[PDB]
Design a protein around this ligand. Structure first.
Ligand code: 32W
Ligand code: MG
Ligand code: MG
Length: 265
């Protein structure tokens, strides 16, 4: 593995959350010749489960981008198995926004979406299909920088219906274009300050609604240009959806022309 670290360099500070295979902790990483850094630690079962859990670390270690969670290291030679990443002070974006409901400006929200879109642009360029892009899988640092998290080389836990493109649900064809659909859902989550997508519907109702041309309405106070970008991401034809460089360009144009963001339906 790339970034194997001696367990003596890690001090676990406190449990900060619950992950899929175990606890999420905050800790301190101090390696010889390097400054001490704050880390988030995921601790871990069968051999296939261990290889799947560690597959997150394998791919994360091959990415380097300001909007992609940074791998600091892994503990595999010793037990328990750990994945260490940079610590993100504000945690998951959906809960962060619910805590701060209506407290960030449209320009700040657009900056967060631009950061997510830059991370996705990088992944699509690397031919990496996320498949689980959702606000709960975005982490936020003290400066409000949004980073894509939740990596893995495993195949579908269950398909996250509410965030998945219709061709991906129906034919299990996951592409950067189905991630563009998911990104549209993330835009809606952000502009709604962490509301659950299709909150008043079940998974089967969502599958039926989407197939029957229903699309999420603009969140309260959402600029029309942002809801139009959502509708573009939600085109039934995957080839008609904007690619991530187009998404970033559209958001940069909004940031540059804030008067456009004043138009609300
Ligand atoms: C005492 O607990 C109170 C509740 N917890 C928080 O407020 C909280 C705040 C910040 C974060 N930050 C954080 N920072 C980085 C993370 C990184 C991962 C991760 C992802 C993939 N592989 C390994 C780790 C998971 C969660 C992560 N969470 C988490 C919880
Ligand atoms: Mg780089
Ligand atoms: Mg996932």
């Amino acid at each position: 593995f790339a970034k194997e670290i001696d367990v003596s360099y890690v001090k676990i500070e406190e449990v900060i959350g619950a992950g899929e295979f175990g606890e999420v902790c905050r800790g301190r990483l101090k390696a010889p010749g390097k400054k001490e850094s704050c880390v988030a630690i995921k601790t871990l079962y069968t051999e296939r489960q261990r290889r799947e859990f560690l597959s997150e670390a394998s791919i994360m270690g091959q990415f380097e981008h300001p909007n992609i969670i940074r791998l600091e290291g892994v503990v595999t030679n010793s037990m328990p198995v750990m994945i260490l990443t940079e610590f993100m002070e504000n945690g998951a974006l959906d809960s962060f926004l619910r805590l701060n409901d209506g407290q960030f400006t449209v320009i700040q929200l657009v900056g967060m979406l631009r950061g997510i879109a830059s991370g996705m642009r990088y992944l699509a360029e690397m031919s990496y299909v996320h498949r689980d892009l959702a606000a709960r899988n975005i982490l936020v640092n003290s400066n409000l920088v949004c980073k894509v998290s939740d990596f893995g080389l495993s195949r579908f836990g269950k398909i996250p219906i509410r965030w998945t493109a219709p061709e991906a649900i129906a034919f299990r064809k996951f592409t950067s274009a189905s991630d563009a659909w998911s990104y549209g859902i993330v835009m809606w989550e952000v502009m709604s300050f962490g509301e659950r997508p299709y909150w008043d519907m079940s998974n089967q109702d969502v599958i039926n609604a989407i197939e029957q041309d229903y699309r999420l309405p603009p969140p309260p106070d959402c600029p029309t240009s942002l809801h139009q970008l959502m509708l573009d991401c939600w085109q039934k034809d995957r080839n008609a959806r904007p690619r991530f460089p187009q998404v970033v360009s559209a958001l940069d144009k909004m940031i540059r022309n804030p008067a456009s963001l004043k138009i609300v339906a």
